[PDB]
Amino acid sequence: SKTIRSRSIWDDAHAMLEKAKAEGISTVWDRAAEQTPAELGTTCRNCIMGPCRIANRKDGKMRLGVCGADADVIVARNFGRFIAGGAAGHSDHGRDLIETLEAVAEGKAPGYTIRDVAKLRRIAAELGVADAATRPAHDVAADLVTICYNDFGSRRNALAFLARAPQVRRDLWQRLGMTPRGVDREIAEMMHRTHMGCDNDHTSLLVHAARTALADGWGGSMIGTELSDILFGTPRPRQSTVNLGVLRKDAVNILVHGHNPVVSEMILAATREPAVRQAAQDAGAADINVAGLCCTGNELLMRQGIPMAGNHLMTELAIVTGAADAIVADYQCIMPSLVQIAACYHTRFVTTSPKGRFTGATHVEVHPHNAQERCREIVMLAIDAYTRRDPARVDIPSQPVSIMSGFSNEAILEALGGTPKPLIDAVVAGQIRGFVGIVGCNNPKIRQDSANVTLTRELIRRDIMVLATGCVTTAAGKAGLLVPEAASKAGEGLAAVCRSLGVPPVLHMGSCVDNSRILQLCALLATTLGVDISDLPVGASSPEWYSEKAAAIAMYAVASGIPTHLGLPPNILGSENVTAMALHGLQDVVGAAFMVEPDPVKAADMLEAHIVARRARLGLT
Amino acid sequence: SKTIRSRSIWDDAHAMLEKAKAEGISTVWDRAAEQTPAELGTTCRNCIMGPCRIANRKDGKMRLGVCGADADVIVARNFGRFIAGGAAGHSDHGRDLIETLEAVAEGKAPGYTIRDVAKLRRIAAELGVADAATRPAHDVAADLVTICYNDFGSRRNALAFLARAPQVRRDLWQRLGMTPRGVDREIAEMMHRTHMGCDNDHTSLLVHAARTALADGWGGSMIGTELSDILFGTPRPRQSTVNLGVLRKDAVNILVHGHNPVVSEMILAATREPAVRQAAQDAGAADINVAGLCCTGNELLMRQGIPMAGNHLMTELAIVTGAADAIVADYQCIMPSLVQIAACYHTRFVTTSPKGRFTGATHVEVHPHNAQERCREIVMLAIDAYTRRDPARVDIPSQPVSIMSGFSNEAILEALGGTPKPLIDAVVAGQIRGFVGIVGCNNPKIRQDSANVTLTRELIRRDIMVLATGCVTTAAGKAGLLVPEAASKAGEGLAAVCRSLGVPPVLHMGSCVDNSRILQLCALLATTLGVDISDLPVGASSPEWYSEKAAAIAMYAVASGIPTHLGLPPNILGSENVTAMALHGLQDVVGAAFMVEPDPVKAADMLEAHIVARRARLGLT
Ligand code: SF4
Ligand code: SF4
Structure with a gap:
């Protein structure tokens, strides 16, 4: 009911932006308004002969960098590193799922199983595993892990899942020099190309940018998608609900944030244990309410029907409700401002990954061999935070909205x-x-x-x-x-x-x-x-x-x-x-x-x- | 004999900077003076919620990015991507040498051999090849290639050459989370960490920066060094000479630029062929003079005693002499301004790598299977450029200086x-x-x-x-x-x-x-x-x-x-x-x-x- 209404179209966001404004909490929109003033991409920082800037000054100066690079090369190199950073996110996501399946095949991941054995055999036979339909599953799982690891290697001519593309599309990539060869390899060659005095042609730099992203879609992302179904089940159509109203004032609210379902699935399994459920009742909670944020919420929404609290710009407003008892995060898109906003309340901010570190956060590092043990500890920290919740600051806005998900x-x-x-x-x-x-x-x-x-x-x-x-x-x-x-x-x-x-x-x-x-x-x-x-x-x-x-x-x-x-x-x-x-x-x-x-x-x-x-x-x- | 003397301490540089000033040629120093005005590292461009800038403004604003990152995280993330780009250069260098040895072991690289069979066995036995001292060489070479490729993979706990470090040093890296696991893997995890909402702790970001560089020194660089000795001979002490005076007005001058010796060694072998030597005489040249620039010149200096023309800021001045008949470049530190300065003369600017592309250059792509054939074509283009040399613009400055090299x-x-x-x-x-x-x-x-x-x-x-x-x-x-x-x-x-x-x-x-x-x-x-x-x-x-x-x-x-x-x-x-x-x-x-x-x-x-x-x-x- 102010200029806040120009920041979001939803009522629950308007209610929390007003609540954050009253409590004196700065949000992303506040910080976005300050950073209103490098958008042209004509600034280069790849070496300390610069940093250089390309302009159309009337004197004709600053047309080239110190090394002699023009505006085409500088923009292309900044864009290639932009694409590489995005591919690297999906690369580690798929790599962590490969390591989880290997730990299941070796019997070293308590709480993890092969949920979809039928999909394991179909994917393995598609990628070249011999007798994948009739051999024991853990042996088939190990061969599939080998093929996936080799796609994170440097010896293949093309990724395994690239065979799904039409023949004319594959023949087009090969002629263009665009065929993705290795998930990690194309990221490393992009950083090599954008070094001073390496690739100084905007056409070939852009062609490699496409090749790097193809290693994401047909490599890192596709490996991460298909192994998640093997380890946690293929999603089927099911009903659930969204918006901040999925939080419960009468229950412990655990907000899972990030991307990797390897962590959030074990958090959900811990909240369903009888001894943990009994402990939540001892704290005076009617239940343990798990809600999803961003992509890790989409993961639990597709395979478990778990309600979603919000998306990107809703994560801060989810803590402003005063009902968030714990934020469990792994990596990617976890704004560091969440740690400061959680400090304003009782919310326990927990990180779980060596790659997703936050200064001032409670770090409980989760791995396949101790996920079942560490996640139980994490849920206990949420139950404890429920006892310290401030009742006069809880205002869960709006009412949940019905959805249907699980359309793989x-x-x-x-x-x-x-x-x-x-x-x-x-x-x-x-x-x-x-x-x-x-x-x-x-x-x-x-x-x-x-x-x-x-x-x-x-x-x-x-x-x-x-x-x-x-x-x-x-x-x-x-x-x-x-x-x-x-x-x-x-x-x-x-x-x-x-x-x-x-x-x-x-x-x-x-x-x-x-x-x-x-x-x-x-x-x-x-x-x-x-x-x-x-x-x-x-x-x-x-x-x-x-x-x-x-x-x-x-x-x-x-x-x-x-x-x-x-x-x-x-x-x-x-x-x-x-x-x-x-x-x-x-x-x-x-x-x-x-x-x-x-x-x-x-x-x-x-x-x-x-x-x-x-x-x-x-x-x- | 001007303010030019404040740019270099050498006489040959002063002579060529005066020659470039008279001929109206802009050099790196000219472009460096224009780009005199992001040096604090407090500017971030990792997403389009920014670009953001961190300042100590009196109003207290712009202290955090749009995502909430402070100055510690932004500086650490820019520094980590700086280190990753440097590691990626050495990564592809070692990878190209791995691919060359594999091509030799398979008999698919005409002109390449195993020059140091004794070092092949010692390195292979050190890295874990079974019976490396008594098995046939090409079989030993293939097993070593497998171990090297696996270090460019994602399954090892530590790189192979890491065993050379003292035990206390390895035990220190392991406790710190600093042990390098894969050459390409640590580069990809660095780009993942520096994505928005991933690693937001300056300590862990710097620890991974060390781990990424360790994957360079004990991985990519060490693999590239040891395979170069296996393929081209271990360097021994020998005498040679340096400075621009190594160019000959009476001979065809071929300047090899870049880093990879896989290309420059075959260029040198082509200049020694009798039919190619005869063709240089037909053009009126007393000989074919090969001179080295930057690291690929160091390679030929260590193993062949080939004279070095100059280093980084000498590459432009080498063409100003008017005697450079060809510039053969692969990748890294090849300033794109060389193509424009070569256009001012008769110099033929040749590129040889898919990664080192330059707009306006003569591209003759060299690979192990056609290096012997393509490099012969490259030398013929140099001999042809010798016929079109402008005699009134040739001024090779100074006299060569004796050196001793080859101290492996x-x-x-x-x-x-x-x-x-x-x-x-x-x-x-x-x-x-x-x-x-x-x-x-x-x-x-x-x-x-x-x-x-x-x-x-x-x-x-x-x-x-x-x-x-x-x-x-x-x-x-x-x-x-x-x-x-x-x-x-x-x-x-x-x-x-x-x-x-x-x-x-x-x-x-x-x-x-x-x-x-x-x-x-x-x-x-x-x-x-x-x-x-x-x-x-x-x-x-x-x-x-x-x-x-x-x-x-x-x-x-x-x-x-x-x-x-x-x-x-x-x-x-x-x-x-x-x-x-x-x-x-x-x-x-x-x-x-x-x-x-x-x-x-x-x-x-x-x-x-x-x-x-x-x-x-x-x-x-
Ligand atoms: S690589 Fe070239 S354009 Fe970029 S900072 Fe260095 S000198 Fe300037
Ligand atoms: S990652 Fe954060 S600091 Fe960097 S540009 Fe994006 S919002 Fe700004």
């Missing part, structure tokens, strides 16, 4: 009858004109979820099915769009298909790493049709992205032949040639390009224009 | 009688008070080689033997310090030892990657003495460093227990805690620390003060 590729095919042919024929008729994966973050520079939900409504109204992943899940869920009754907000053709299957017009497909499910579905549809991915009526969008990670997702979507839209532009506008390559040049190279547009309705026209063109290229109506 | 650890031990005991007893007596490895680059912010040669004279005068690598070789060589007669410029004790062995007081130990030879020697002396590397009277210095690569070398020297001096400071002064950790905090952790001092005489006192303290700790005189 296996679940989508099961609703279709085990075959993509019903989905194809619906696209042939003209009921579903195309698919668009809406993915990405929030960003304080844009009213929270305003562009995410707007584009989602515009697309489903034009008979375009939306595949939601990442923090957009919270945006779509709180808009009432993740239920089968949301078909009334879709066009006539899409609504008829949704009511036939009992599914919503927006399918939740998981966390950010689960964007590999979209690649898997796009590769499966292009394979059955016999065409390239650049021929399918597909699209991708990140209207409110912020991280290096979303840029890497957008990059490997473009490199795979999916026209990708970005709300805010990357720090590349200081070079017209790099800008012309990203926006127009890539269209000839890989069959897709980036789209920068802050207007979500206009972006719906551009996404639909690409889709109708690809429908024409298929000779469809 | 194997050559040092051979001069000592096959045992380090003569070297130890000389340090016990007080003749050689300590060893200091002078390494690093040039930097336009400092008068060229003024601090490099000054410190070299100060150290040898105080009876401290200097081990020279990298671009400091050109500085020491042109100062007449790389000959046995230079003992007259050393103290009484050091001069007596040098005249006994017939060696100079400054030992040339190779290129930048050959800094692993210094680690190998420091580990060997600490092992025979039974103490830690932090107990040996050793030191390291980079008075005129510029690259991410020298910072990684300085970092893994500190992490190995060697007090390291830097002329210019890294971009870390915006955080006192990070500065206090690098300068003082690391002394308690790893037994050494960084030393920032622009005064070379003062740095000689600080290096000697550390050495005399370690001599006292050993109870020596």
